[PDB]
């Protein structure tokens, strides 16, 4: 059970990093040069 | 249309300002996609 | 318990990859052309 609680904390910061990562990628599309692909 | 549907979906707000500064054109502002 | 220790190592390199991935995305915003979205 100590191995599971170590793994839960190692997953809780992983999903915290991924959500922090997701807003960065949302910022990339928000601020990006698009001229050739403007439909 | 598809420029506005893309720029609004991904937060590109300055693209949306250059698409909606043409006033008195509200058919495309409420047009829905597929 | 051997299944949990296999899963902990399969998660330890996953968060190692994600941190390596996060600095790449931080580099993308660091070196990116922004002209249309300069407020």
From Swiss-Prot, chains A, C:
Give the highest taxon in the source lineage: Eukaryota
Q: Where does a 1,2-diacyl-sn-glycero-3-phospho-(1D-myo-inositol) bind?
A: 6-12
Q: Which residues form a coiled coil?
A: 2-31
- Locations listed in the record: Cell membrane
Modification after translation, per record: TRPA1 activation by electrophiles occurs though covalent modification of specific cysteine residues in the N-terminal cytoplasmic domain. Hydroxylation is required for TRPA1 activity inhibition in normoxia. In hypoxia, the decrease in oxygen concentration diminishes the activity of the hydroxylase EGLN1, thus relieving TRPA1 from inhibition and ultimately leading to channel activation.
What disease is mentioned for this protein? Episodic pain syndrome, familial, 1: An autosomal dominant neurologic disorder characterized by onset in infancy of episodic debilitating upper body pain triggered by fasting, cold, and physical stress. The period of intense pain is accompanied by breathing difficulties, tachycardia, sweating, generalized pallor, peribuccal cyanosis, and stiffness of the abdominal wall. Affected individuals do not manifest altered pain sensitivity outside the episodes.
Q: What does this protein do?
A: Ligand-activated Ca(2+)-permeable, nonselective cation channel involved in pain detection and possibly also in cold perception, oxygen concentration perception, cough, itch, and inner ear function. Has a relatively high Ca(2+) selectivity, with a preference for divalent over monovalent cations (Ca(2+) > Ba(2+) > Mg(2+) > NH4(+) > Li(+) > K(+)), the influx of cation into the cytoplasm leads to membrane depolarization. Has a central role in the pain response to endogenous inflammatory mediators, such as bradykinin and to a diverse array of irritants.
What's the subunit arrangement here? Homotetramer. Interacts with TMEM100. Interacts with EGLN1. Interacts with the scorpion wasabi receptor toxin at the same site that electrophiles but in a non-covalent manner.
- What information about domains appears in the record's comments? C-terminal helices from the four subunits associate to form atypical coiled coil structure; this region is probably involved in binding the inositol polyphosphates that are required for optimal channel activity (in vitro).
Q: Which family does it belong to?
A: Belongs to the transient receptor (TC 1.A.4) family.
The name on file for this protein is Transient receptor potential cation channel subfamily A member 1
Which organism does this sequence originate in? Homo sapiens
Recall the taxonomic lineage recorded for the source organism: Eukaryota, Metazoa, Chordata, Craniata, Vertebrata
